[PDB]
Write a protein that binds this ligand. Structure first.
Ligand code: ZMP
Ligand code: SF4
Ligand code: SF4
Ligand code: FES
Ligand code: MG
Ligand code: ZN
Lengths: 685, 85, 48, 208, 114, 96, 124
């Protein structure tokens, strides 16, 4: 059972195999460290964590030394202090004098630990070394003279990203970390080497020289670039977004964020909508006033009612705006409310959340024994979900099988065909993987929502539900899973939006509200002549060029809002900056439009809007909660009513390359760093 | 008068919602088949009493409490809502 | 300065100027940074 | 010898500890705690209702002739239930010594004025009231001393903004100075300076 | 639950003190107008005193009422002794501040403030 | 490299120039715009490239304690020249 | 020693304007650990901060102007209960976020050299 150790004479009970560093963490002491990271493997080479045992003559490395029974750990001992001073003396003896010209200046673990557990003087009278800088892509700037050879980037690269391209070339004092050849370290998780590097050897190239840590203000929010719902911290200085950093959440993030999340913040400063715009007598877009634009839209809304009113919700819309638009369109008896992504409406459809949620939580992947991925590329659709899958693979020997096109995941997997015919065959039991699933104690079936965009999505959903039913026929564990790639999709489905745009296609509307709809699913060729289009958004990409009235709105960094991720967890984004120019919050715009049109919505403040959200769906106001009910039996019973035949077309994921990963949405398209990344991955260097 | 949407809010681990849970368990499937195009959304509350929200045309809604109801009572309440009485 | 001339530099002013306050040559402050956010220019081609 | 480390006076430390024990024994009804810092400063933590007896004893006792009131101030700690902390610094010329008396008090709890014991307490308590909101029951004249007339709020509380809420300027329309909501041309820049590494292991708190 | 009083043991004594303070302020408005040469009328001063008294009518704790009446007595003492100027007396009357609209549409038009 | 903007206004070394529709140009009417004629980037480009026979060279900016902190530059990569980033000075190893 | 059951409302005594009393939503949270550093000494006390308001640019010199007095106001509390009590007695609206401690992890240096597991590393 638990063993008893002593830290500075204080008794503490720890599990067997616990290290001295973790025992000190238990008692509240933080041992200094340079090479140790709790989410990486143990290295034990920096030697900064040397602590003294009470009667042992030689100090031990706390990061790699399991505790023995009855050991007394002297963290503040004379030997420990001298060892720390010696190690810091070596590190600073070979380190270069680059602190003022270094982006790591005020947030450097070398400086802080030198000032805490180091000497204040130097007796190094020799000359320092200099190392030629490497080039590993447009995202990471390398000044390798500042590297302390802690091998965090190598261990992170290998274990987390599955990319074995970093390593140490050389021997002795001339040992260098690099790729040897001029290969660029490009991945969907490549800024985390910038995060984990304790020194300024690896630094963010877009953020280079812009600011200092003490100036910036930190706003804790969530990431809106996919359905993972990663927690982020936005660093802003003087009302300008300076950078994005990961925020720890051991159920979603686990301290990492994707490169699109980290480096697309500069797309919020380009191609922005700042003032309301209307068509003039020449057919061109000209700036106008909020009163004029809202009066025009209100006149059109009063003129047209019924099924002649459609709303298309994009990928970066929040629950408050969605519910406000839903109420506004319901006030005119209209119901052409839709989201720009397709989900099968047959059977239960959106009536049960378990039918379209990721029922096995992101943290629940680490418990699964077998996972079957259907019609998805999790590496680019949800990089953090793929990282969790790889971690489960590496640690618990998880068996991963992928049905469809052989994408390059960061781990070895069992490939199953390319067509849904094999997917249907597994349900019957002819495939050996049926036996594998039946013998697996913890199976998961993750169907990518990108495979539901084709015309046979309902049949795909029915087949995977049949597979899950066969698995269940053979407690508290959930097998069926759906992985989304759109942040607003889950919130829209919870609020009651109709998936897809097929309803709008079948009943062409006269008034169309494009709320952030930049997917180009519906155009004026599909719409009737003289259709009135109101595009409400923050970036002008497609909807703004095709619109009649353009309403500027706020981004996620600029509004306080609610987003539901792919697993059903609701999280609130906080305000970091204010909308530029005359741009306003989306739900406030909708409320003002309703008031001008004479259909005043019964909420004037964010609290009242969230009360309406609670009335519609309490899970939208229950924050950071993922517990729910599993109505899989009812969902399957309703699904097995109608039968559709799977098409013979292969399951080709929309994203097959990292360039396709880089260019996905409006903010990424407006970014210049993303354009640099695409050019680097296509042309080379 | 024309019904547009039905919402059933039931907490999943409360004694008062036990009757509403039993309706979903073995009576929801039959109801949905008879009303294929009706948005009967089922959600989960936290501590409030179970409720039945009925949204009609032009954004008009009525809420009916389902606290401590049995399975049959929920069926009768839904039948009254569907039939307009 | 005749005995100890100052060090000569290519950027040091050759002509000295007194206080120019209250004169057209007075210093006027201004922001030395570029615009932060670029707006979206609408297309110049009518859609219909 | 250690040139860069301040010397220590064990004799004075022991004398202060002995006097703290002496006063604690003499006044058990009010004295809650006695401390001696490592730089030889004696601190007495007492109940807020024993201020007058403790100060009278420490002023008139033969062995405790602290005739001079050195200072009187308050410290606002929002996390505590009794946020305000009234501190009395007393000086004894007879024995060439200093003592510190501490008292806790919240917003709505009055304290007995010490103007009867020390005369400087008049203006010191006026300043404490003006800057924190702490009320003194038996004060001959309690009113604002430092802040502007009609000023709303107590500036030294930790929840009061640095720049306040209003600012003054001359308005030509009314031919007088007016008060308007504050609006800074350049906002005060808050700097996050605390290091994420513990500097003093001696003051480390339990992990809770 | 149980706390020491300041001046009033219960709400009746607090209300009595409030009435006394109101009487004292009411009897001093014409003198304040005359001494400071204010351009307002006596009725405006009485109405402003009434408004100031009515913005704390929701207070139910006797200690808060005692502190409020103490502060009011302090402010009256400053006015009677002519320690303040015309500046502060007119600062009571928000006169150079633009009228901030309290409707959603106007607040939406002007800016981002709630 | 003082260049004149389309509106007849001098452009500073930071690329600063008010637009045609910017009202803020009124502050320069009947007055002048303070622009420093010497451009540090142009001057440092005009400065030549020092060649030394060593792989690592130390730069302190000249003058000793009156310069910048001493740094060491690795003159291995023959594609470019090693630049001291405090003073922006280029050093190179002989090739031909 | 009188008896009262009020909720300790000092709104009328603080002197804050009613606008900043009733239209402010504060956030009661433990600040997240800065990912650029490995120290955890800044994640031990609860912080109370107000909502961000508008910040425009000065027409002259382009400085960051503001009109929110409580923009730089950050309070430190030892416990969530103390922070919530302070917020309630001051009358501002508030939202509280629970502390997110890092869960304990199993780490073994011998796992890097495994006979038959995937945890074996290809480099040191
Ligand atoms: P009845 O007892 O029902 O009386 C009605 C009220 C509502 C007053 C009750 O007495 C009651 O229950 N009130 C609630 C508690 C209470 O008494 N609150 C009053 C607080 S005392 C107060 O606020 C006095 C301070 C105001 C000072 C005003 C300053 C004068 C400004 C003049 C400016 C211009 C003059 C020239
Ligand atoms: S990495 Fe740290 S120690 Fe090295 S130059 Fe940068 S701030 Fe200084
Ligand atoms: S580059 Fe950074 S993370 Fe990699 S070994 Fe060097 S100091 Fe460590
Ligand atoms: S932290 Fe243990 S040797 Fe590096
Ligand atoms: Mg770094
Ligand atoms: Zn130099």
């Amino acid at each position: 059972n638990l063993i008893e150790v002593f830290v500075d004479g204080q008794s503490v009970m720890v599990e067997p195999g616990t290290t001295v560093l973790q025992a000190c963490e238990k008692v509240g002491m933080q041992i200094p460290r340079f090479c140790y990271h709790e989410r990486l493997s143990v290295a034990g080479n920096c030697r900064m964590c040397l602590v003294e045992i009470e009667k042992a003559p030689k100090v031990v490395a706390a990061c790699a030394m399991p505790v023995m029974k009855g050991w007394n750990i002297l963290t503040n001992s004379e030997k420990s202090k001298k060892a720390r001073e010696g190690v810091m003396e070596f590190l600073l003896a070979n380190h270069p004098l680059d602190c003022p010209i270094c982006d790591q200046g005020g947030e450097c673990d070398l400086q802080d630990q030198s000032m805490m557990f180091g000497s204040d003087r130097s007796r190094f009278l020799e000359g320092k070394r200099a190392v030629e800088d490497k080039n590993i892509g447009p995202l990471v700037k390398t000044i390798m003279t500042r590297c302390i050879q802690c091998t965090r980037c190598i261990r992170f690269a290998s274990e987390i990203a599955g990319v074995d391209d970093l390593g140490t070339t050389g021997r002795g004092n001339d040992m260098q970390v690099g790729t040897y050849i001029e290969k660029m370290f490009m991945s969907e998780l490549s800024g985390n080497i910038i995060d984990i590097c304790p020194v300024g050897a690896l630094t963010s190239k877009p953020y280079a020289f812009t600011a200092r840590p003490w100036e910036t203000r930190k706003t804790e929010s969530i990431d809106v670039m996919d359905a993972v719902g990663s927690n982020i911290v936005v660093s802003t200085r003087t009302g300008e977004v300076m950078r994005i950093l990961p925020r720890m959440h051991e159920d979603i993030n686990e301290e990492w964020i994707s490169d699109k999340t980290r480096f697309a913040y500069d797309g919020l400063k380009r191609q922005r909508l700042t003032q309301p715009m209307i068509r003039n007598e020449k057919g061109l877009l000209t700036y106008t006033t909020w009163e004029d634009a809202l009066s025009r839209v209100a006149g059109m809304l009063q003129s047209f009612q019924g099924n002649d009113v459609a709303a298309i919700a994009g990928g970066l819309v929040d629950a408050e705006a969605l519910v406000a638009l839903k109420d506004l369109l319901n006030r005119v008896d209209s119901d052409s409310l839709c989201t720009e992504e397709v989900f099968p409406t047959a059977g239960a459809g959106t009536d049960l959340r378990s039918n379209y949620l990721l029922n096995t939580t992101i943290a629940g992947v680490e418990e699964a024994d077998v996972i079957l991925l259907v019609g998805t590329n999790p590496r680019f659709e949800a990089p953090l979900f793929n990282a969790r899958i790889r971690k489960s693979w590496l640690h618990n020997d998880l068996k991963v099988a992928l049905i469809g096109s052989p994408v390059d995941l960061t781990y070895r997997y069992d490939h199953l065909g390319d067509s849904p015919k094999i997917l249907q065959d597994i349900a019957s039991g002819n495939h050996p993987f049926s036996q594998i699933l039946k013998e697996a104690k913890k199976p998961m079936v993750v169907l990518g929502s990108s495979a539901l965009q084709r015309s046979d999505g309902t049949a795909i959903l029915a087949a995977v539900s049949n597979i899950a039913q066969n698995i269940r026929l053979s407690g508290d564990w959930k097998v069926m899973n759906i992985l989304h790639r759109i942040a607003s999709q889950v919130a829209a489905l919870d609020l009651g939006y109709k998936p897809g745009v097929e309803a709008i296609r079948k009943n062409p509307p006269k008034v169309l509200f494009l709320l952030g709809a930049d997917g180009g699913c519906i155009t004026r060729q599909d719409l009737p002549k003289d259709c009135f289009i109101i595009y409400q958004g923050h970036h002008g990409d497609v909807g703004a060029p095709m619109a009649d009235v353009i309403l500027p709105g706020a981004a996620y960094t600029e509004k306080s809002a609610t987003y539901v991720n792919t697993e059903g967890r609701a999280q609130q984004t906080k305000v970091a900056v204010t909308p530029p120019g005359l741009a306003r919050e989306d739900w406030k715009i909708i409320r003002a439009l309703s008031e001008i049109a004479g259909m005043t919505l019964p909420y004037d403040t964010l609290d009242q809007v969230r009360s309406r959200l609670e009335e519609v769906s309490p899970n939208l106001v229950r924050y950071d909660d993922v517990e729910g009910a599993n109505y899989f039996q009812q969902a399957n019973e309703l699904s097995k009513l109608v039968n559709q035949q799977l098409l013979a077309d292969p399951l080709v994921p929309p994203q097959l390359t990292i360039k396709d990963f880089y260019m996905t949405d409006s903010i990424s398209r407006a970014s210049q760093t993303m354009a640099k990344c695409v050019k680097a991955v296509t042309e080379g260097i | 008068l024309g019904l547009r949407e039905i919402r059933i809010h039931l907490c999943q681990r409360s004694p008062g919602s036990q009757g509403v849970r039993d309706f979903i368990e073995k009576r929801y499937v039959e109801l949905k088949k008879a009303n294929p195009d009706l948005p009967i959304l089922i959600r989960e509350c936290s501590d409030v009493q179970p409720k039945l929200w009925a949204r009609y045309a032009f954004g008009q809604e009525k809420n009916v409490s389902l606290n401590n109801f049995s399975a049959d009572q929920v069926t009768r309440t839904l039948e009254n809502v569907l039939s307009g009485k | 300065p005749t005995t100890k001339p100052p060090t000569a530099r290519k950027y040091i002013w050759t002509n000295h100027k007194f206080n120019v306050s209250g004169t057209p040559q007075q210093y006027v402050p201004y922001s030395t940074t570029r615009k932060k956010i670029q707006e979206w220019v609408p297309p110049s081609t009518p859609y219909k | 010898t250690r040139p860069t480390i301040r010397p220590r006076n064990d004799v004075v430390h022991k004398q202060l500890s002995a006097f703290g024990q002496y006063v604690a024994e003499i006044l058990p009804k009010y004295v809650q705690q006695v401390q001696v810092s490592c730089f030889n400063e004696l601190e007495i933590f007492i109940h807020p209702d024993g201020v007058i007896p403790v100060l009278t004893f420490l002023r008139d006792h033969t062995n405790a002739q602290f005739k001079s009131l050195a200072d009187l101030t308050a410290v606002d700690v929002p996390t505590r239930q009794n946020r305000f902390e009234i501190v009395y610094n007393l000086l004894s010329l007879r024995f060439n010594s200093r003592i510190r008396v501490k008292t806790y008090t919240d917003e709505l709890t009055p304290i007995e004025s010490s103007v009867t014991v020390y005369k400087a307490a008049n203006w010191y308590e006026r300043e404490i009231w003006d800057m924190f909101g702490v009320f003194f029951a038996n004060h001959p004249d309690l009113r604002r001393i430092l802040t502007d007339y009609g000023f709303e709020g107590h500036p030294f509380r930790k929840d009061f903004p640095l720049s306040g809420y209003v600012e003054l300027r001359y308005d030509d329309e009314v031919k007088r100075v007016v008060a308007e909501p504050v609006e800074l041309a350049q906002e005060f820049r808050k700097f996050d300076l605390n290091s994420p590494w513990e500097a003093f292991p001696a003051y480390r708190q339990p992990p809770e | 639950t149980s706390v020491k009083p300041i001046f009033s043991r219960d709400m009746n004594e607090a209300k009595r003190r409030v009435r006394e303070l109101y009487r004292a302020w009411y009897r001093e408005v014409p003198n304040t107008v005359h001494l400071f040469q204010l351009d307002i009328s006596v009725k405006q001063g009485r109405d402003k005193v009434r408004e100031m008294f009515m913005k704390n009518a929701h207070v139910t704790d006797p200690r808060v009422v005692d502190l409020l009446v103490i502060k009011g007595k302090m402010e009256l003492e400053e006015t009677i002794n002519v320690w303040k100027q015309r500046t502060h007396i007119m600062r009571f009357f928000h006169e150079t501040e633009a009228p901030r609209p309290t409707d959603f549409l106007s607040k939406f038009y002007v800016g981002h403030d709630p | 490299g003082v260049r004149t903007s389309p509106t007849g206004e001098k452009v500073t070394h930071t690329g600063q120039a008010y637009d045609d529709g910017d009202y803020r140009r009124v502050r320069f009417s009947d007055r002048q715009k303070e622009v420093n004629e010497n451009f540090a980037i142009d001057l440092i480009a005009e400065q030549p490239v020092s060649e030394v026979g060593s792989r690592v060279i130390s730069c302190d900016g000249g003058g000793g304690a009156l310069g910048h902190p001493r740094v060491y530059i690795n003159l291995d990569k023959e594609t470019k020249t090693g630049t001291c980033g405090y003073c922006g000075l280029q050093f190179r190893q002989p090739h031909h | 020693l009188i008896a009262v059951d009020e909720k300790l409302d000092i709104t009328t005594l603080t002197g804050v304007p009613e606008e900043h009393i009733k239209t402010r939503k504060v956030r009661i949270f433990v600040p997240a650990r800065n990912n650029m550093q490995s120290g955890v000494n800044n994640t031990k006390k609860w912080k109370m901060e107000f909502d961000t308001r508008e910040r425009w640019e000065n027409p002259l010199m382009g400085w960051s102007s503001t009109a929110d007095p409580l923009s730089n106001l950050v309070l430190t509390f030892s416990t969530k209960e103390d922070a919530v009590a302070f917020a309630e007695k001051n009358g501002w609206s508030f939202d509280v976020e629970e502390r997110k401690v890092p869960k304990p992890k199993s780490k073994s240096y011998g796992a890097n050299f495994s006979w038959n597991k995937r945890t074996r590393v290809s480099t040191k």
